[PDB]
Scaffold this active site. Structure first.
Site, PDB file in Angstrom:
ATOM      1  N   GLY A  11       0.804  -1.212   0.000  1.00  0.00           N
ATOM      2  CA  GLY A  11       0.000   0.000   0.000  1.00  0.00           C
ATOM      3  C   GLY A  11       0.839   1.265   0.000  1.00  0.00           C
ATOM      4  N   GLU A  12       0.194   2.384  -0.302  1.00  0.00           N
ATOM      5  CA  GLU A  12       0.864   3.669  -0.294  1.00  0.00           C
ATOM      6  C   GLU A  12       0.229   4.508   0.785  1.00  0.00           C
ATOM      7  OE1 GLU A  12      -0.345   4.331  -4.925  1.00  0.00           O
ATOM      8  OE2 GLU A  12      -1.205   5.736  -3.461  1.00  0.00           O
ATOM      9  N   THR A  14      -0.070   7.643   3.680  1.00  0.00           N
ATOM     10  CA  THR A  14      -0.254   9.075   3.493  1.00  0.00           C
ATOM     11  C   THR A  14       1.094   9.755   3.279  1.00  0.00           C
ATOM     12  OG1 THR A  14      -1.496   8.677   5.560  1.00  0.00           O
ATOM     13  CG2 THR A  14      -2.013  10.681   4.334  1.00  0.00           C
ATOM     14  N   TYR A  15       2.088   9.316   4.046  1.00  0.00           N
ATOM     15  CA  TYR A  15       3.415   9.906   4.012  1.00  0.00           C
ATOM     16  C   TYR A  15       4.423   9.159   3.137  1.00  0.00           C
ATOM     17  CZ  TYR A  15       1.033  11.821   8.069  1.00  0.00           C
ATOM     18  OH  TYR A  15       0.107  12.373   8.919  1.00  0.00           O
ATOM     19  N   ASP A 118      -6.033  10.749  12.381  1.00  0.00           N
ATOM     20  CA  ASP A 118      -6.455  10.257  11.070  1.00  0.00           C
ATOM     21  C   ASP A 118      -6.865   8.767  11.083  1.00  0.00           C
ATOM     22  OD1 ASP A 118      -7.094  10.572   8.337  1.00  0.00           O
ATOM     23  OD2 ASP A 118      -5.052  10.053   7.683  1.00  0.00           O
ATOM     24  N   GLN A 122      -8.403   1.644   6.893  1.00  0.00           N
ATOM     25  CA  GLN A 122      -7.088   1.294   6.303  1.00  0.00           C
ATOM     26  C   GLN A 122      -5.955   1.320   7.328  1.00  0.00           C
ATOM     27  OE1 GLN A 122      -6.722   2.030   1.529  1.00  0.00           O
ATOM     28  NE2 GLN A 122      -5.669   3.396   2.981  1.00  0.00           N
ATOM     29  N   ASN A 123      -6.117   2.065   8.416  1.00  0.00           N
ATOM     30  CA  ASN A 123      -5.073   2.074   9.427  1.00  0.00           C
ATOM     31  C   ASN A 123      -5.445   1.349  10.708  1.00  0.00           C
ATOM     32  OD1 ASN A 123      -6.341   4.136  10.872  1.00  0.00           O
ATOM     33  ND2 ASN A 123      -5.262   5.713   9.694  1.00  0.00           N
TER      34      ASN A 123
END
Ligand SMILES: Cc1cnc2c(NCc3ccncc3)nccn12
Length: 289
Positions: A11-12, A14-15, A118, A122-123
């Site tokens: 995955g990509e 946020t940072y 946030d 996904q997290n």
């Protein structure tokens, strides 16, 4: 980085991009996240913020002026698990266990005055033992929260608390309780609660369900930076309509997690004591890896 062998991209974030990797020495399998002294110091603090429901930050590698964060690896995230459980839905006892664990994680972080800021499916990462853990804890204060990831992928607004949307500069730990309430509703109904696609659409979706906030339910709201007297006035809906067929204990807790006034919104510690968790258990999810 010469100590790790990239196995695959998982995955990509946020940072930056996240990879599954293997320590060339210990053989340990980890998640490697490719990302200022303030940022370095803040991230460093996170290494000590350890709890069973917080994805462990193993190490920080700062080289060639590039930043890599080495995390504990988990096999699946809640977004994938929810998509996989779409036909039948996640059983209530498992939803309840996940919520209870995430509240424990939040209560821990909040006691140390660290916010996530946030939270989103996904997290939230899960394992075969029935554990669920918070990923990327603290990275928002460390580096900041952008509008578009380095991949230009739109950062989701769906779980953002109304005080952030209304321009509060010094929001609190209550923002994470809001996010978690949104995720709780989504696990129960199998649909995102407030899938906004712009800041105003996000705010208006909140208002349409919970009623347009005013000085009665949220003292001081009309003074907030981005509040406008011209906002439409929508009436509040019953939670019986919003999250059927959640029981009264669950609806009561969800209501306190979605209170408009951040001062009155339930804390993670108080939520752990709510009657909804009287019969909490720890079932095992059926994961297909
Ligand atoms: C910091 C971190 C630790 N484990 C994960 C993770 N695991 C799920 C996964 C595993 C394998 N292939 C795709 C997704 N996804 C994102 C971030 N992660």
């Amino acid at each position: 980085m010469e100590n790790f062998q990239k196995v695959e991209k998982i995955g990509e974030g946020t940072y930056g991009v996240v990879y599954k990797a293997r320590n060339k020495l210990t053989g340990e399998v980890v998640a490697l996240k490719k990302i200022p002294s303030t940022a370095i110091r803040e991230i460093s603090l996170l290494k000590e913020l350890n709890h069973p429901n917080i994805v462990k930050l193993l190490d920080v590698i700062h080289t060639e002026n590039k930043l890599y964060l080495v995390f504990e690896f988990l096999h699946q995230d809640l977004k994938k698990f929810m998509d996989a459980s779409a036909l039948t839905g996640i059983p209530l006892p498992l939803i309840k266990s996940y919520l209870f664990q995430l509240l424990q994680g939040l209560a821990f972080c909040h006691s140390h005055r660290v916010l996530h800021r946030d939270l989103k499916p996904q997290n939230l990462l899960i394992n075969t033992e029935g554990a669920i853990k918070l990923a990327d804890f603290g990275l928002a204060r460390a580096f900041g929260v952008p509008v578009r990831t380095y991949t230009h992928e739109v950062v989701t607004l769906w779980y953002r608390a109304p005080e952030i949307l209304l321009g509060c500069k010094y929001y609190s730990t209550a923002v994470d309780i809001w996010s978690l309430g949104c995720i709780f509703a989504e696990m129960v109904t199998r649909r995102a609660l407030f899938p906004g696609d712009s800041e105003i659409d996000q705010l208006f979706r909140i208002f349409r369900t919970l009623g347009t906030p005013d000085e009665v339910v949220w003292p001081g709201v009309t003074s907030m930076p981005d509040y406008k007297p011209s906002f439409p006035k929508w009436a509040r809906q019953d939670f019986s309509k919003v999250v059927p067929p959640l029981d009264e204990d669950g609806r009561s807790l969800l209501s306190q997690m979605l209170h408009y006034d951040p001062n009155k919104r339930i804390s993670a510690k108080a939520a752990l004591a709510h009657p909804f968790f009287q019969d909490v258990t720890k079932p095992v999810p059926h994961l297909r890896l």
